[PDB]
Amino acid sequence: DHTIKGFLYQFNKTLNSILSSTDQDEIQIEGIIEDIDIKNSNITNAIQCKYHESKVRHNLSDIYKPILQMLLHFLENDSLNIKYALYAYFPNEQVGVKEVTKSQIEEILSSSNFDYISKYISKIKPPKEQIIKELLGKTSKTTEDKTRIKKYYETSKLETIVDIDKFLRDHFVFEIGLSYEELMNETKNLLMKEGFSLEDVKDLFYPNSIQYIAELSILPEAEKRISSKNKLIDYLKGNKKTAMSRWTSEVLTRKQLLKVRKNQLVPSLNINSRSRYFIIDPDTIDNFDDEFILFVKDYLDKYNSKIKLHTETPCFILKTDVNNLSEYHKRFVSRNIQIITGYIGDTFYFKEFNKEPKRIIKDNWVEFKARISCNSDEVIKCINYKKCDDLYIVGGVDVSLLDTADVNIENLEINNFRELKYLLSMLKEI
Amino acid sequence: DHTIKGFLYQFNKTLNSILSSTDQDEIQIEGIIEDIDIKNSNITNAIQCKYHESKVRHNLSDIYKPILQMLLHFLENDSLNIKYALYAYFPNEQVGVKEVTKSQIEEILSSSNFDYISKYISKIKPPKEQIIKELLGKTSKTTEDKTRIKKYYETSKLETIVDIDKFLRDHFVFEIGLSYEELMNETKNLLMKEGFSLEDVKDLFYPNSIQYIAELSILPEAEKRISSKNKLIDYLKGNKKTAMSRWTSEVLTRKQLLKVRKNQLVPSLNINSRSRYFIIDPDTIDNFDDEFILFVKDYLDKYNSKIKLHTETPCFILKTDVNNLSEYHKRFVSRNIQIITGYIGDTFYFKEFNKEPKRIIKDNWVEFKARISCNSDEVIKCINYKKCDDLYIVGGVDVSLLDTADVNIENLEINNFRELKYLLSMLKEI
Lengths: 430, 430
What we know:
This is part of a larger assembly, with two copies of chain A (430 residues). The first copy, chain A, is of the alpha/beta class. Chain A is built from 16 helices and 17 strands. Helix content of chain A is 46%, strand content 16%. In chain A, the strands form four sheets. Chain A has a seven-stranded mixed beta sheet with strand order 5-6-4-3-2-1-7. In chain A, strands 10-15-9-8-16-17 form a six-stranded parallel beta sheet, with helices on one face. A two-stranded antiparallel sheet of chain A has the order 11-12. In chain A, a hairpin with a 4-residue loop joins strand 13 and strand 14 (365-366). In chain A, helix 1 packs parallel to helix 8 and helix 8 (180-193) crosses helix 9 (198-217). Chain A is elongated, with a radius of gyration of 37 Å. The first copy, chain A, starts with a helix and ends in a 7-residue tail after the last helix. The A-B interface holds A 1-5, 7-8, 197, 199-200, 202-204, 206-208, 210-211, 214, 217-218, 220, 239, 242-244, 246-248, 260, 263-264, 266-267, 271, 387, 405-406, 408 and B 1, 3-5, 7-8, 30, 197, 199-200, 203-204, 207-208, 210-211, 214, 217-220, 239-240, 242-248, 293-294, 301, 331, 334-335, 426-429. The PDB classes it as antiviral protein. Keywords: anti-phage, nuclease, ATPase, 18-mer, antiviral protein. The entry is titled "HerA-DUF4297 assembly 2". Chains A, B are DUF4297 domain-containing protein.
């Protein structure tokens, strides 16, 4: 349980650092240098997280290995402007920056542990004997070699290549961290300052952020572990918006939702001179064949009846084959409705589909009142050539090949022609 | 990463067990006996979780330690009706209950590892020599003592106090667990069976449950680690209800404020011959690039559509650079909207920007319908040269360089184009 609590404390510290950083700061979760690597414009901040709730008092030996690792990294990267930080929590130690003296650092380098001497102290303090260097260079070290190295490092005085004074003065800082509960509360309060309420932070934002940190921690690739405050905020806001939409679309009945959609669509439908295209899937509307002609007749009677005012010809695109289009053309010509399909036989003609109808105002005559065709590639090229004002999609037809840039798209979720007529304001009440 | 994945797998298994258990079952996360301690009315179920994704084939030695600890606990608690379960995942092993024979158990007790022999095998198989008993009773054991104990337990045949047959028949069960992804999917499906949707579980319920399990696991008190399905369900439902109450019914303040602001702004928007200047910061509006053109088109359709009545031209000033202005110019020209930017290449021109548009009422032609430039000093000077009636500021752009003397300033606090359309009376309900 202690390891899990330490991992949670490290994740909370990383989240707090992400929240407290600016938009220009790049932070690497489980960074190359330490647990938290904050990359600013000129200074890189490396923070090591240690949890010591079970320790009554802070001891120098508790921070031997981390300080040795930081010293080794500083020795290997002295030319880099990296600020090394050690974030360790102790229940009985006052929260704040704790100074580490040069004598304490020298005491760390004099530790009798063989692992530390072989890993970090040897590189910090190179041995002056070639035999000891060869022993340290062995991949596998026997017990006699370990004892010899330990005795040599305990008895011999070796110079320190690492500039301890400069490291402590500029590139090192030790801070006594807050408790796990206090750190979590501070992180939640930081989430509060981002416009998020306590309820939202407690329920959604904090667990999602913790899961995001945990997921980024286990990624083997270092580049994929780089995150930022803006990215986390955007991810949380997107999740919140999706949850809001999903939860809101569960209370209102069908009629209220349809009324809301109709009120949304009225302003665009009130304009006399807009080009409106409809993409319809016949299999999502009940009794499409028996009712399609009357629907088009009513639509033309409402929105394409005034010769002087209504200037734009509507277009209807259907997910069907050419033979059904010919049958619909027969049924339209039988009812004295003039349409154009762009098909002569089986071939499609560009210059027929896209021609503008001729008007004689005195005779109240328009050459054709609507365009009706199928969703073939040529027809979609015709649509893309002459971009429409409003593009209504009925039945979830694949719009992947249409150019939808700067085109107002209105997805209509209906299942019968009564609903479609109600949404387009051609009926007063269902 | 392997340890973190194993901890996540254990937490997912605990969550799945909690979901699958009945309302009368008490489950202790990180229980005294094993990882999962499900306490029924008369039978206590102990589950040990192991993750072995990196192991190609399951081996008996992989489960030596959990089985030995389990056998020792059963020996110490033979009078209790406790059923012990081993939940270990292996990629190449079929999911289901796997039988462990008595010969395999005897092989486990014959393991050559000194740690197992001294910890569990010694208590399961007591030594018949008092010297070995005294050596095992020592808190600190030297290498010679370890070697002597290992040799004695390897060479001597010792009887087993624990009833292996009864244990295997009644109090033991070994199951090959599912994969981490499969376990997570099953847990999410179980959460779906409680009345929660898939996305709701993914965004809120699953992270909340995982955080709850993690928080309960690290609790030092065993009693505080006791959980149940009803408690978790109630906690999740309370979190969902609080999130609902904070998200919905909070729109009242925003909608009422927006309605008040709209009513404030209506009187000046109904006059047909006013000059209106907009200063917009794109970073304060969601999806500015994808929605700017349609917003300008709608504003021109409502306020610059009547040639003989709408006589003034709007002016949109953006906090961007010249290249983005050129891109927007391209995009406007592609949509047959005539705008003037005042830039020929990279040089601003005073006389181009502030020329009045020509009109031919017979052909219904206006030379350009909008002015769209950047917030450069020259553009600000052009704005100051010809003073406007209404000045609208979006996003709080710096207006220190503008001559605001005797100018009606209307600051609008919005975060999306839908709200702006609502305020400018181009929509009737958000």
